[PDB]
């Protein structure tokens, strides 16, 4: 009928708009606080700094290497990252490289196109052949770095040109062999019925016999040129023998070992600062994973198939609504200091305070979770990369499918490890809440009783000082026992 008794309710933190996280028991649990681990967003544009980026607007790396006329701006050009656009084309004598990707990767790894000419002596043979496929400027022309040798008078002799190497770096020589389409064309240019081109250093030799066939029409020609490369090391010599069909080099390309590479993309370039480059823009390397693209350049996160991986750093987020009760029905949106709290209602009035001994016990465990996830996924990443490298024996020709299943197995383990910690986080947070309800029940003993809604009903008058005695670990029930039992049993 009056202020004879008081109420002490237990509750926890709660917010209206929580975050959904994955666990093992549930597919999605709304928690109070979490963080995103994948970088699915991107500015869209590529950042010009800190790496030296080179936009090959219309010219591929090979075309700029060889000397396609519209690529002549790229001479001696250097780069940290060469980018190739989709629009890039070739407009020069039709050709083909047997090891295109191998040569493209070799020259890309060296961040330079530094070419120096050399004084080859092609005696008895006319130099600087030309084609109207590459008109160069007003007149006919050819590749910049290639010397097309054609017969002189009515004689094309056997050329044996030697060229030693007396430098500390490695030289890269690019040359070619011309494949005419008729025997008439072969005789007119080279006199001989059948040619040869031989290039060697030391043990290595390459010997190519030209093939007279009619190829698919390109730029008014059914003839083609095959491009080969040859590396000479310090102290080595380059010897070139040919009785015909020789597309000679002008010099060599000085290649340096470096951290350069190449990637195909159409993303625009902008003035910004980004460490990690992806074909669809630049992304910040602050998150552990990224969904933006598979191929990247620079210090980048790991690639992940799914566009979301959230690590729970809170507790079960149950909200409030409509219409006092504790944690059985709804959390407390008003309690913001800590994840476990007390509320009460006594003669003095309603009050509230957080329990930091249990909140700290949860925080101290959640503290090193993100770092723990990063250490484990990194080990599993380089594990899945170390193994899964062999692939049950390999065939270069048809491995397109292996990366598609590497990403799946890696994404499965990563999403599983995040779900392992989220389960552990939900477990330990709910544990500290139930342990608090046990500590208070034990403390009150027969002086109160569980009301069923996460609260107690203290059957004696318990002022704010008495309530703080319950929150503190110092509450003697024996002194209030006689008073509370009098009210009980009545």
């Amino acid at each position, epitope marked *: 009928n009056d202020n004879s008794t008081a109420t002490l309710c237990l509750g926890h*933190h709660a*917010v*209206p708009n929580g975050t959904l996280v994955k666990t093992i028991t549930d597919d999605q649990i709304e928690v*109070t*606080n979490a963080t995103e681990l994948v970088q699915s967003s991107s500015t869209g544009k590529i950042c010009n700094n800190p790496h030296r980026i080179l936009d090959g607007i219309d010219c591929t790396l090979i075309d700029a290497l060889l000397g396609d006329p519209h690529c002549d701006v790229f001479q001696n050009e250097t780069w940290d990252l060469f980018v190739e656009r989709s629009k890039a084309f070739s407009n020069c004598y039709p050709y083909d490289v047997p090891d295109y990707a191998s040569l493209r990767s070799l020259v890309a790894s060296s961040g330079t196109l530094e070419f120096i000419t050399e004084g080859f002596t092609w005696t008895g043979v006319t130099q600087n052949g030309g084609s109207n496929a590459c008109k160069r400027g007003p007149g006919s022309g050819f590749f910049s770095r290639l010397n097309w040798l054609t017969k002189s008078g009515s004689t094309y002799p056997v050329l044996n040109v030697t060229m030693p190497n007396n430098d500390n770096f490695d030289k890269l020589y690019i040359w070619g062999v011309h494949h005419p389409s008729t025997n008439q064309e072969q005789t007119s240019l080279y006199v001989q019925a059948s040619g040869r081109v031989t290039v060697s250093t030391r043990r290595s030799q390459q010997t190519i016999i030209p093939n007279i066939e009619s190829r698919p029409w390109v730029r008014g020609l059914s003839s083609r040129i095959s491009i080969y490369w040859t590396i000479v090391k310090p102290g080595d010599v380059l010897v070139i023998n040919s009785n015909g069909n020789l597309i000679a080099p002008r010099g060599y390309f000085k290649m340096r070992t470096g951290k350069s590479s190449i990637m195909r993309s159409d993303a625009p370039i902008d003035t910004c600062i980004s460490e990690c480059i992806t074909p669809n823009g630049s992304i910040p390397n602050d998150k552990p994973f990224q969904n933006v693209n598979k191929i990247t350049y620079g210090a980048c996160p790991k690639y992940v198939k799914q566009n979301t991986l959230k690590l729970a*750093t*809170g507790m079960r987020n149950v909200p*409030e609504k409509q219409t006092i009760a504790g944690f059985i029905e709804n959390g407390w*949106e*008003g309690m*913001i*200091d*800590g*994840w476990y709290g007390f509320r009460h209602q006594n003669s003095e009035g309603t009050g*509230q*305070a*957080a*329990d*930091l*001994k249990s*909140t*700290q016990a949860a*925080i*101290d465990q*959640i503290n090193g979770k993100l770092n723990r996830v990063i250490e484990k996924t990194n080990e599993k990443f380089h594990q899945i990369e170390k193994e899964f490298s062999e692939v049950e024996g390999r065939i270069q020709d048809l491995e397109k499918y292996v990366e598609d299943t590497k990403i799946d197995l890696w994404s499965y383990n990563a999403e599983l490890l995040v779900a392992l910690e989220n389960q552990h986080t939900i477990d330990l947070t709910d544990s500290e809440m139930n342990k608090l309800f046990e500590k208070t029940r034990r403390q009150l003993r027969e002086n109160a009783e569980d009301m069923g809604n996460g609260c107690f009903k203290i059957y004696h008058k318990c002022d704010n000082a008495c309530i703080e005695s319950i*929150r503190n670990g110092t509450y003697d029930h024996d002194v209030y026992r006689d008073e509370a039992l009098n009210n009980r049993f009545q």
Partner: antibody
Amino acid sequence: QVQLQQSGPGLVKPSQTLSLTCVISGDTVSSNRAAWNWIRQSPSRGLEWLGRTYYRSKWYTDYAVSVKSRITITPDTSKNQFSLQMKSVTPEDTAVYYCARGSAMIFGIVIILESWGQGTLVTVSS
Amino acid sequence: EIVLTQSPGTLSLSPGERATLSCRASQSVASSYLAWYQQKPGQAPRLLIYGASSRATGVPDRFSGSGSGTDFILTISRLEPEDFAVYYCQQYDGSQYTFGQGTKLEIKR
């Protein structure tokens, strides 16, 4: 990047009512991510937290015990400010009073006063 | 409530040396709820360390926090003449904020 600007440094006679205001710029008083505190500082008492107010679909106010009786912190949404009233002032209430905002910094909790006002000296003298 | 006691009350140091400020607590304090502030003369307190060991935005690695229970320490590694101020430790217990008396750090010259 909130900017808190408080009222003018003045004089209030003994046994009167202290009354200050904190005009917030760059944030809302009804923010679901902030709490607005009042703190005073004097040579005798030191730094003393007086009270706070925050909005979580409802207006909550907390007060220190030493000042609970004579204080009322009221938020004003229309002017985006919140005021402090202290009553029956005594010469022990001469201090510099600080408007300060608190925001959670650890996993969504552990409110911490990180943005502070300039502080207005008020003297209780007859 | 909980009371915070700072020692020493005054500290004099030559630039380059390291300052260590201790914050003593009547009762055990939650490690996440102890912060340190810097108050330069005529200005409001500026947040330095929060949660015992966590650096705020805009403070260098010279400032680092540590401690647990009733013993918390704040260290300033590479002193500068700009680091003259009064440093306070603050705690939160549930329903109240508490501050220490402060440590006046004056730099020698």
